[PDB]
Design a protein around this ligand. Sequence first.
Ligand SMILES: O=C(Nc1cncc2c1CNCC2)[C@@H]1CCOc2ccc(Cl)cc21
Ligand SMILES: O=C(Nc1cncc2c1CNCC2)[C@@H]1CCOc2ccc(Cl)cc21
Lengths: 304, 304
Amino acid sequence: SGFRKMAFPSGKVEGCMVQVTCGTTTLNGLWLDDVVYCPRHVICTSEDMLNPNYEDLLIRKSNHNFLVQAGNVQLRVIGHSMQNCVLKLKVDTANPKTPKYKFVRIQPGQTFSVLACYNGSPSGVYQCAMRPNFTIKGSFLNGSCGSVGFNIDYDCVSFCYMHHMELPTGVHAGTDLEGNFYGPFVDRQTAQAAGTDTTITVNVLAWLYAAVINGDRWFLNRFTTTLNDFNLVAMKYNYEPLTQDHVDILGPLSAQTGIAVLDMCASLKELLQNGMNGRTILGSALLEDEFTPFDVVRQCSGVT
Amino acid sequence: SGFRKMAFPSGKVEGCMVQVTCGTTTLNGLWLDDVVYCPRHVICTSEDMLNPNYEDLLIRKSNHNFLVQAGNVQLRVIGHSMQNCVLKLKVDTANPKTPKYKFVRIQPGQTFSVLACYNGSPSGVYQCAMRPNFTIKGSFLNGSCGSVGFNIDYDCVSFCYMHHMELPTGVHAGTDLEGNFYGPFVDRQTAQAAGTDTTITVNVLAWLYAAVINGDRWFLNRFTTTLNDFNLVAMKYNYEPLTQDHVDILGPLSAQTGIAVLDMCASLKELLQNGMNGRTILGSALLEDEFTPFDVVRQCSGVT
Ligand SMILES: O=C(Nc1cncc2c1CNCC2)[C@@H]1CCOc2ccc(Cl)cc21
Ligand SMILES: O=C(Nc1cncc2c1CNCC2)[C@@H]1CCOc2ccc(Cl)cc21
């Protein structure tokens, strides 16, 4: 028992982190097979970030201008190409620690682990959610760019995020591993609006089921609701609308606990309208939305 | 910017996890150099746990009864000894992935990362605190015993915890890597009282400094207090008494923010007496005590 904000073991990803330097800019790269992936802004100076023309900036760079260091050894760069907002540096050596991997574009509301890195070295790992507005609330300092987010399914690492930018609001923005930004963001130093963020309703419900499994049951009530009535409340409290697709993925948790999805929706409705009344759920005084129904099933069953 | 409950990268520890089986009991072991460390209750059946005589139970076991599997290969056990509540299995092969390491006994209030494992395989990593009552609030299912807690300082892994038991309250108890339980616990299936738990005051103050660094400043007030007045309030709210030693370790955070330790104590006093008034600090609606002053300095500076 017990329920924690658990990250995936980061070993398979640590073995892929390298340092990439171009001119005076240094950031993190991801070495998979004979390719190193990093944010394309490694070719910019601070002044270039105001309005960069990446095609023109990259044209002035050659393979020998990209310094790639893995641990203490230097990698020989034999090719370079830009794909959307990432640079792909072809190296003459395959990473011997390359795990089985995939590049995946996650959906808003999905969770992943971030391995925060500086100078190609890992400092920490944490679990977070891709917000419905395509930002992440990470912990990233200067030099953290190129740090990646991922999920693991037994021996396969599905890379889903690469860190690029911190918005003036202190929230974070990045790309998938093909260099496409999540959200409307561009890699320029210009104030960019992240949309209205909402609470990931399906995740909160999954976390309420995780609380029932671990013994926190005070929030259970004698009521029920409909998907329509619940969504009227969710919209009022800036929660994402719950669909039958969301109800479907809550099925295993509904089965284990014997608490129907709409009954759990009624508990969530009362918590939204009345608050916690100074009480806690799984050690939190607010409604947690950073665990998906899959995360709750995985943690409660022991998937290694 | 941003502040997360960050765990240490778990790679160095993943390379040390093995599965240990003795009879019908399987749990996790820690392979360092030519020794495998695991909870001594691996030699018990469920029935034996009621009132085990470990000296007598171990006497019936020989080296060949301890099955140790690392990944897919079997390790040859050439010796066995009990040290307090851990078994040390001498193997004929040194773990080639043994990182630089130390065995350390942490103090109550200190934090560490847990690599939860099942059948010698890592499933997740999370950061937690050793409670003032020597329990931890982990996330451990059946088969998680032998999972370890640790800290990392550049290339050295200081192992501080090995998981052994879940109390009837759902909280967790374990030993240091010499097999000494943290707290008054014994490895027997008998209801055991964990003392009154308290909030780790120095950690809450460090986390308030981390909030100021990241922009959450609403809780700052025009007041100050004394160590005596503050401790009268801390005792009322079941907080640990703050000592000059605690004030001393908050020094770097006090310097960075320009907010004197007793001024931050006054903010904490008002938060204890009045609550948050429906507001959040670093995305939490309660006072977080799972970040030490060292953790806040490390995360805010970027120690890899
Ligand atoms: O956001 C950026 N980096 C950064 C990333 N993550 C955390 C932190 C920082 C910098 N301050 C400390 C915290 C850079 C600098 C600003 O101008 C731009 C513009 C576009 C892009 Cl893609 C990147 C950047
Ligand atoms: O606590 C124990 N294991 C366990 C450990 N962590 C999490 C969970 C469990 C079991 N239930 C699921 C969650 C075992 C069984 C109970 O009797 C004892 C008595 C003493 C000792 Cl050292 C160990 C144990």
